[PDB]
Paper text:
PB1 domains are protein interaction modules with critical roles in the assembly of protein complexes involved in autophagy, signaling, cell division, and redox processes, as well as the auxin-response pathway in plants. PB1 domains form homotypic interactions via conserved electrostatic motifs molded by basic or acidic surface patches on opposite faces of their ubiquitin-like β-grasp fold.
Of the three PB1 assemblies studied, AtNBR11–94 (AtNBR1–PB1) and p621–122 (p62-PB1) formed homogeneous filaments of constant diameter that appeared best suited for high-resolution structure investigation by cryo-EM. Image classification of segmented PB1 helices revealed that both AtNBR1–PB1 and p62-PB1 polymerize in two different tubular morphologies: a projection class with a ladder-like pattern, we term L-type, and a projection class with a serpent-like one, we term S-type. Further analysis revealed that the occurrence of L-type or S-type assemblies is persistent along the individual helices in micrographs of AtNBR1–PB1, whereas for p62-PB1 filaments regularly displayed transitions from L-type to S-type symmetry. For p62-PB1, we observed a four-stranded L-type assembly and a three-stranded S-type assembly. The L-type here has a pitch of 135.9 Å with 14.16 subunits/turn, and S-type has a pitch of 138.6 Å with 13.60 subunits/turn. Using the derived symmetries, we determined the 3.5/3.9- (L-type, p62/AtNBR1) and 4.0/4.4 Å- (S-type, p62/AtNBR1) resolution structures. All four structures form tubules of ~120 Å and 150-Å width with an inner diameter of 45 Å and 70 Å for AtNBR1–PB1 and p62-PB1, respectively. The main interactions are formed between a double arginine finger formed by two neighboring arginine residues in strand β2 (R19–R20AtNBR1/R21–22p62) stabilizing strong salt bridges to acidic residues (D60/D62/D64/D73AtNBR1 or D69/D71/D73/E82p62) in the OPCA motif located in the β2–β3 loop and the α2 helix. In addition to the canonical transverse interactions, the helices are further stabilized by longitudinal interactions Y14AtNBR1/N28AtNBR1 or K102p62/D92p62 and R59p62/D93p62 to subunits of neighboring strands along the helical axis.
Author numbering:
A (entry chain A), B (entry chain A), C (entry chain B), D (entry chain B), E (entry chain A), F (entry chain B), ...: 2 to 105
Write the structure that this text describes.
């Protein structure tokens, strides 16, 4: 399941500041034997890869979102919630919206 | 009864700060024998799951609401009152509105 | 459980004089056999590490605090009370507030 | 009945000098058979635990209070009076106010 | 694989200020023996050549982009992402869009 | 790992008095054999080089800082803490903030 | 390497008081045999020539600066730091900013 | 599945001439045994009920529509197409748009 | 590959007369054994389904189109040309434009 | 060299009557050994494929054109002239204009 993720980085008034467009492999998985318990999570691997590409942000300091049917930026941080996020993929493009974690 | 809960987290002037959109299983229930008295309550399981998802709040320190026909944010904390809250579900989306418990 | 501790050292009017930001390993533990009774405590290892980093203070002469929901600097010195202190961690940052032990 | 007690230690002009925030188990009770007459009292177990945590005070030399509806620091020392003290719990936080027993 | 790169330098309101049009040799590579580990990267050689031509910018202080199918300026800085950038070449012209790295 | 350090020297109201901008080689290391135990530390080599450049300060009499995500000047003096300082590098610029050690 | 240096002399509120615009020969060097150890330094020859032109200042009593990408007046006094200063030359104009050394 | 149908009857320039607002029971179904093959269809029962309410139209002489995401009046006459029509229900209101079948 | 086809039926001045919006299963295929040579074609199954839904047209007497990047109604009748038609799908909606085959 | 050909079929007043948009493989060629002299020509394979797609025309009875820089429909029938036709490809779209061969 080759899945393209188009990571929007949002700015001041929720206008996009930098777009990245990488590829992601959620349903694919490594070798079918346990070298660990079971890897990282599918949302933990996503946020580890969004943090690796953008130079403007550091890992652990950003909140990834998506747009639902109402147009609202629904956040996601879990991997049982990333599966609800990915039911909104249009063609193969999973558009996420990155916002940084400021003061309050 | 698969039931989607869209948890709005309200901010300063009751504008939404973070939206979460999980799923909830009120009328479904576990195995039909008593390993306890009867579990937690259906409102106790809801507020335990809203607190588990949001990183911005800690359990016991938030008040969950809903909108009635007048547009008012009616609070709910009981499980005989959660049944009156859930008579306002529109399609299958049970929109709650989270507010934190500050000074006074 | 990698846990970041941001140690504020408070000054005259409870304004921060020096901030340190180390990492702490409370729930992790050494080898699963007894070379002693059971190590030091998880609060004894914390206050031994806060005293090791700051040159401005000496061990046994400082009181570590935290902020609760009311904004008050609740002190902690026990390890059954450090577990109540650590239920206020926000992302992974456990902010403590150090005050020195003066005359009276 | 898990019950959180936030022990304020009052100072010179009834300003708080040290806050402790422990947990207390009034309505819970041990094994349902008599190894004694009936334990200590529920107020005797409270004041034995407030004295155990604070290093700044010694047992038998402090007066625990609470705030009533008038804002007054009503003292309590009995266990038929601790039950009237605990009808002022707000969420699960039972705020007591400790004052030491000086000269006159 | 002779590949023409038309480097647009963007200005204030994303209007082009200076255009350069050089040639680039991504899939071609030097002698088939290791004088190093493996050269620079194919994106590192691109950004080293864009910085060499423009006198108006200095290396390390510019962000190269491209236009995707939506018309958005998708940035690229990696060499596993330059391969996704170069799937949008039209005839042999790989149009990149240079933006400088200002304050915030 | 070529790493640029931009040393701000702070003044009266934490306004910068002199900026220096040198280069630093933390992860690079000398010849792979022991002429000593293991050199100086990576934080000891940093503070020895900040003291060598500025004529306005003398070695052993300055405290180097950095800004975390909260905007606070977190100090660092150790080399297990310099590794946490250097997880805030933005492009390749590691901005430190120098303050001198006065009376009290 | 003919290199033009435009020496701004800054005044009260960092406004330019006198501009000089001379030429400088950093990478060029004299006869390829040692009449000395190796001349003066390339920063020592620069500050000896800035002091020779301006009548308003005397040698040893001025601090030469440059502007980095942030707009800050980064000072330089070394000749391993003048090489980092000269990576900001725009066409062939190396703009330095002179400030005199007053009381404190 | 109680489902409200708001039947707009369109006029000359696609302006609504009469609105009816009845209720419909698509996913509900009668007794679970075959008194026939399987009833009428779920679209045949809908158009039989729209024709029963409006006095201004006669059955077999009207075309029921719906609005898609583009704002276009997409017609439907089948019951495998009514299931695509009913994926646009907003709260529980299924707005259809009735147009009569004139000359050409 | 669930693929939605929105069939516009064009009228006199290429204005839409009736819209249908069905679903189509191009890349999906039946059981992996040959009961025939290989079914109908993927364009033959499309035009057999567009003719089945619209009552206003009869099979063999309509020309299906699509819009390319120039805005022109490019026709398609082959199944090696339907694969070029379907590279213009936007989200999952494959908009075709039906025109009937009149005199000349 | 994948090359898209957009075949316009011109009508009465040189307005397009049917557009086809196929793909063409001019510079690609079959197996590198002679089963014939050398295939058909690259213009003979083009006009054999334009005649295969359009049902409205028969092979040998149409004249293929292209637009030059003056906007004129320059015809081509040779394969040393098709190479001059294909120097006007814009992105990868080689727009030809088909006209039928009538009386005079």
């Amino acid at each position: 399941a080759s899945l393209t993720v188009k990571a929007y980085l949002l700015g001041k008034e929720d206008a996009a500041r930098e777009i990245r467009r990488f590829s992601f492999c959620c349903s694919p998985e490594p070798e079918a034997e346990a070298e660990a318990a079971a890897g990282p999570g599918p949302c933990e691997r996503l946020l580890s890869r969004v943090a690796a590409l953008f130079p403007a942000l550091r890992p652990g300091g950003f909140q990834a979102h998506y747009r639902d049917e109402d147009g609202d930026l629904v956040a996601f941080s879990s991997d049982e919630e990333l599966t609800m996020a990915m039911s909104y993929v249009k063609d193969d493009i999973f558009r996420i919206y990155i916002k940084e974690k400021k003061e309050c």
